Design a protein around this ligand. Structure first.
Ligand code: CER
Ligand code: CER
Ligand code: MN
Ligand code: MN
Lengths: 334, 334
């Protein structure tokens, strides 16, 4: 009768499989700058904003015209192998990417057709900027917990190639203003990649990492959003941490790894300092892969898994601040 | 221990409030044809495909540059009044529209900011062509059933004005082929409008209509999709009806109303005939409002409610075939 924080946590949801795809092509910020240099000089800007300010040394792009659905499919095939299960077991496939093949059908339906899902497989896309993979995990978890399905795929493929192409053209225009030039620099922090996760009912996969679920707080009063954005983002993260304390029992010092969505080196620095987080517990791929949107979190988690340092029982915080503004925080126990 | 179909149905989820917005501006197919006539003649086509074939006599457009979020917000304000609750009670807001303000943030976050949701309100968009409102209802229902939230908004605003503007220009081009002309005619079956629903835990709203949930089947092998589309759509609907029998206990003759997504008059005729459905139990707004995408179903349900014929206990089938292909069928008991 009496609510407790722990009551809303998932007790029977696990991560059966996890995979990521690294986009193959390294575009260094050094190479990008060589092309921007004339516009940098002309504008009188001495600042290597990419390398020294945003803190990105390289990002990965696709070599070919990869669609979001292609990248998500490739990650999903790899995640199924990691879980050692066939596609026929999948009862739900959710796509969470910002990148999108078409207006219709859903990117999820395209990935599902590529994989050969059965006619029982439910599919749809969830869109929520950089936080959507966590949303997708939670939506799948609720179906798993209820027993409506036994296995789910959550997938996310991102492609920035076209954004880079268009952006580099506008920024090297003879009539580009320093303002426009600045406003467009931010696209050059984006990167390509993909991730997929197979979630399952725990009884089917004893000893797999457990997904506990988590919390969300919002500040939709700031859906218009500068230094103001960082300030409001941090304030929202503060209230979300309170919610995490109340539901997950989180105390910063008791978490073993923080898998954090990253916007830039300085944004991450400010977040980490604000909450007293130990930098050594924050794996970052931003410097060499850039910001892969909602795929960033599961790609980092996947990279942590394959590095083999995680121990059974490790408490892993998944979190990010997304446009909205929204903030989500969730826990995996390895 | 032993699964039964009824086990996955929601026992504690109700519809507290429901509203729709009719777009104000009537664009008749007569008026549209007057503009197409020269291209019709030039092409030698005697067929009034819109009125006599698709069976659309008019569609509604917005009078001004209405964004999806504006239309959804207007419907949501109306649905809150119908439920007699303030926005502060809402713990989740899902947007399900095809129409989209921006790439980011979510349309849901924009609507939520407009309405003044609290910081506890979770928000995201679900995209699944014409079936997404049903998906959103189900996602909200699972949170309500678990007790994670007490009230949810599911919203959907659609705008086709720009599609109409661009389409009418391409179809009246001196060099337009009969093929292209045909391929583009289909956009002229779309209409504008909005709908919103407040869902709630049943104990908070005794005597409100109950949402039981439903089933989905897919045929993602046909995600590429002609007469073939109608054929495959019907085959998928047949398998979904079997699932509905197995879960909801559906027999066609025992349902009181069918609220069906509509693609065209003949598509609807073929569907209704295939399943032996009584036309008198199928409210249609397509002839005067066209196809409002994923808002079509809740708009028709809302219009049924305000007409006041529904009786406590009436069994209402919600269904549609969406691109994917997907098919979803769900039940409301009034
Ligand atoms: C730590 C402060 C963070 C400020 C938030 C910035 C928004 C970030 C982005 O624009 C993308 O990286 C992801 C997103 N908005 O969902
Ligand atoms: C009865 C047969 C139906 C064929 C299906 C056609 C697809 C319909 C549409 O294209 C939109 O109206 C909605 C949608 N595709 O989700
Ligand atoms: Mn290369
Ligand atoms: Mn008018």
């Amino acid at each position: 009768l009496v609510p407790r924080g722990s009551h809303m946590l998932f007790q029977n949801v696990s991560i059966a499989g996890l995979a990521h795809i690294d986009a193959p092509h390294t575009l260094t910020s050094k190479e990008i700058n060589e092309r921007l240099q004339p516009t940098y000089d002309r504008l009188g800007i001495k600042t290597d904003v990419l390398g020294d300010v945003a803190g990105i040394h390289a990002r990965r792009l696709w070599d070919q015209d990869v669609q979001a659905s292609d990248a998500a499919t490739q990650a999903a095939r790899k995640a199924l192998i990691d879980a050692n299960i066939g596609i026929e077991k999948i009862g739900l496939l959710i796509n969470t990417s910002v990148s999108r093949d078409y207006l219709e059908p859903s990117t999820a339906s395209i990935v599902s057709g590529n994989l050969g899902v059965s006619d029982h497989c439910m599919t749809f896309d969830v869109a929520n900027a950089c936080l959507a993979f966590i949303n997708g995990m939670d939506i799948a978890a609720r179906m798993l917990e209820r027993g409506e399905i036994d296995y789910a795929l959550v997938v996310d493929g991102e492609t920035a190639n076209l954004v880079y192409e268009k952006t580099l053209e506008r920024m090297t225009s003879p009539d580009v203003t320093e303002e426009e030039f600045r406003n467009e620099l931010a696209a050059l922090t984006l990167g390509c990649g993909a991730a997929a996760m197979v979630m399952a009912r725990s009884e089917l996969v004893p000893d797999a990492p457990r997904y506990k679920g988590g919390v969300t707080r919002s500040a939709t009063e700031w859906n218009k959003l500068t230094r103001l954005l960082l300030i409001e983002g941090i304030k929202l993260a503060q209230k979300t941490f309170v919610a995490a304390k109340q539901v997950l029992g989180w105390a910063v010092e008791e978490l073993d790894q923080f898998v954090i969505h990253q916007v830039s080196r300085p944004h991450t620095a400010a977040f980490v300092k604000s909450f007293g987080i130990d930098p050594a517990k924050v794996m970052t791929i931003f410097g060499e892969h850039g910001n892969i949107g909602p795929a960033s979190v599961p790609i980092v988690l996947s990279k942590l898994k394959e590095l083999g340092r995680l121990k059974k029982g490790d408490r892993i915080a998944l979190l990010g601040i997304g446009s909205g503004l929204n903030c989500s925080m969730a826990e995996v126990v390895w």
